[PDB]
């Protein structure tokens, strides 16, 4: 597929003295894996 478009990213929003306290305040306020293969008559067999 297409590699998709990567937008512009802000770099690791700076942590200030009280940023962790604000985050704490916000925290308080809140397979089968088949073993089989079937090939039609035109069979691309490696």
């Amino acid at each position: 597929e297409v590699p998709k478009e990567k937008e512009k990213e802000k770099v690791s929003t700076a942590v200030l003295s009280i940023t962790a306290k604000a985050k704490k305040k916000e925290k308080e306020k809140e397979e089968p894996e088949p073993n089989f293969q079937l090939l039609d008559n035109p069979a691309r067999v490696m």
Partner: protein, 828 residues
Amino acid sequence: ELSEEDKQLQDELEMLVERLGEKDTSLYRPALEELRRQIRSSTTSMTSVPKPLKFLRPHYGKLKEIYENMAPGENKRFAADIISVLAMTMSGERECLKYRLVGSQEELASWGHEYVRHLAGEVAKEWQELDDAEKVQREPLLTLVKEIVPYNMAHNAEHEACDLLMEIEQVDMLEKDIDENAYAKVCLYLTSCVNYVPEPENSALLRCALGVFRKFSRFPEALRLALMLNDMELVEDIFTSCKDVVVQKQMAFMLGRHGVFLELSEDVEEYEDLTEIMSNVQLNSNFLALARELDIMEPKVPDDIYKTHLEDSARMNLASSFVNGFVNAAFGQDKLLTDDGNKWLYKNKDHGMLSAAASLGMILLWDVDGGLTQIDKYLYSSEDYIKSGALLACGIVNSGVRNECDPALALLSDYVLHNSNTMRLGSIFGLGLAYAGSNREDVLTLLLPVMGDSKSSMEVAGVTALACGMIAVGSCNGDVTSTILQTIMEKSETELKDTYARWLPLGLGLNHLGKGEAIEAILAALEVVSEPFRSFANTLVDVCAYAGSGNVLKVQQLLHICSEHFDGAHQGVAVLGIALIAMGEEIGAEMALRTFGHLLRYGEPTLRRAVPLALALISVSNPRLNILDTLSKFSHDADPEVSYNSIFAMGMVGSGTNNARLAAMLRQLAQYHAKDPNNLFMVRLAQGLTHLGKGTLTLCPYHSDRQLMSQVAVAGLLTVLVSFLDVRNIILGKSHYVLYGLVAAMQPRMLVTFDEELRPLPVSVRVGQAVDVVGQAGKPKTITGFQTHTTPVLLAHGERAELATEEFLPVTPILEGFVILRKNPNYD
């Protein structure tokens, strides 16, 4: 490399510890006694290198093992105390109190004061690293805190106790240990810390300091702190919980200078005197007395300011009207309008007339009766613009003065809902700036109904939003919020793109100024607007909420908004918001200046236009070369809007200062932009601002000690600056009348004294810079650079006045504005 006695002590300690190691279990008690005696003898001494502590460093682990392996009993804790005092030096897993709790629990002073300091810091650290559970583990730490706070009180370490209590997050126990010899040095420290901490700790510290002040009957300081908290019940309690009448008079002066007005019943000793003081009915008389006492009552025409003699179609004449109003503000007398009259209110070419008449109001500022007379002469005109300007003039005249009668209400209510968006557009604004701090329901009941009706443009709706916000600044008035939100929800993407719609979010923010967190609801009930008018409204209401809060997280969010590339006006609002959240603490302001410079360089035009407004807001009537140079080097910018804003910001930063090296910049800039009328108008307006009230008024929204943020002043400043956020259309055109919003901010810059009878007492004072020598975490600030005058006197920015002689005691410990002075009984 030691000494013989030192080696002998080392050997003694080694022998004692080894005996502890030996499993005799019979002579443990003598050895522990001896170790404890040596350790406390060394620790309590003045030696900063306690020798027993030094020599037991190797054996720390062995002492741990001995503590663990000895059977429970008295010796257990009797050695745990030794282990703790040792751990005072070696740490990393923070043991000292971890072994003090299982200890002998003796007086927490026998082990010197260094032990106390270490254990206090460790109690704080344990407190932070405890979850809301483990409460049973938390009481024994409060016992150590009750042993530490008194000890710090007795040993001059009041700042240590304050730090311990504000870091334990319980600033409530100081009241038990404070003494009349401590309240000053504790309240000052708490107040200093307030500006820099966030909520809810900001309010916790403010209420703690208020309680300390109320304990010792320091009512004026308690009222200043109660005003910092925008809480009217507390100020009512303080103002009515007092028995001395003179101090109540002084507190009434303080309330009047601030925007508040207390409705007092018929119970206080002197209700009428107090309401007169708190209503500012004596502001005009005092101002005129000050003007007479300085020889300034001599109206100066605009030409005296332009000073074009040394070194007129339609707009420079509007500039003449505006500068005339600004210069001769609150003086009553004038020479252009007052006197000849009918000449600079005509030939102003239609729309400018609406503001020229308003100029009259700003000349008769705080003068209700003279206002009435001169304005009524002009209140009956064949053309609508004159009547609108006269109504606005009545509003200006009644601004800041709480007359018992309601002239503004009557006159301007007759013309609200008028069948013309020009009498509406002056009467609404007049009511808004006349009853700004009032919060009266009877004026909002008349204003709110006019935002919604087929016969109202975006101009009328926005000016009603401004008015309602100014009436109810920082009150979370449900009716105002509901009506503004309805008006925002009832208009399409177009019809919401007028730049007169900025004023509905501005009304919201003004109505929520300083409330802060409680704003989520309005930014949660506002996430349904169109995209281009939702970042603007969201950002504006957010910045208004945190006005003067100094919340670095919110400033970070605003800077994130600025970083985004949108080829977008909410970025301009975010720059002004960075200014708005940081006009409080001084340390924040200079750093914001650095940030604004970076924004000017690494910035798109949209926020480039907004940086000058931020510079104006952060420094209002505070001319500093750092900002004036910045604005001057940007007064020549290619972008017209950045220029315009830079010129007006030079006007604002120097407003009411008469600065000579700003007047020179403005004249040279007037020649430079002679051929551009759109810059000539703005330079003329900056000149008028620089000479505002001929050097007698300040637009700063911060009065008492630079610490009380007047809500009304911020309201006016925000109206004007947000209007500048679109200069080319809002103000360089139709709605140049919005400049008169500054009326809400202009407030004398004088010190005037009285006796205990409301009669002047000229007394000698020293006026000088707000400097100190050593803060020492609590020491007051003392003026440096004295200059002795006799009151009345004008205080410039950064100037404080201290009574040059001991003859009088001020009621308030702040000599700014009106101060009642008791005649000292002691002497002098």
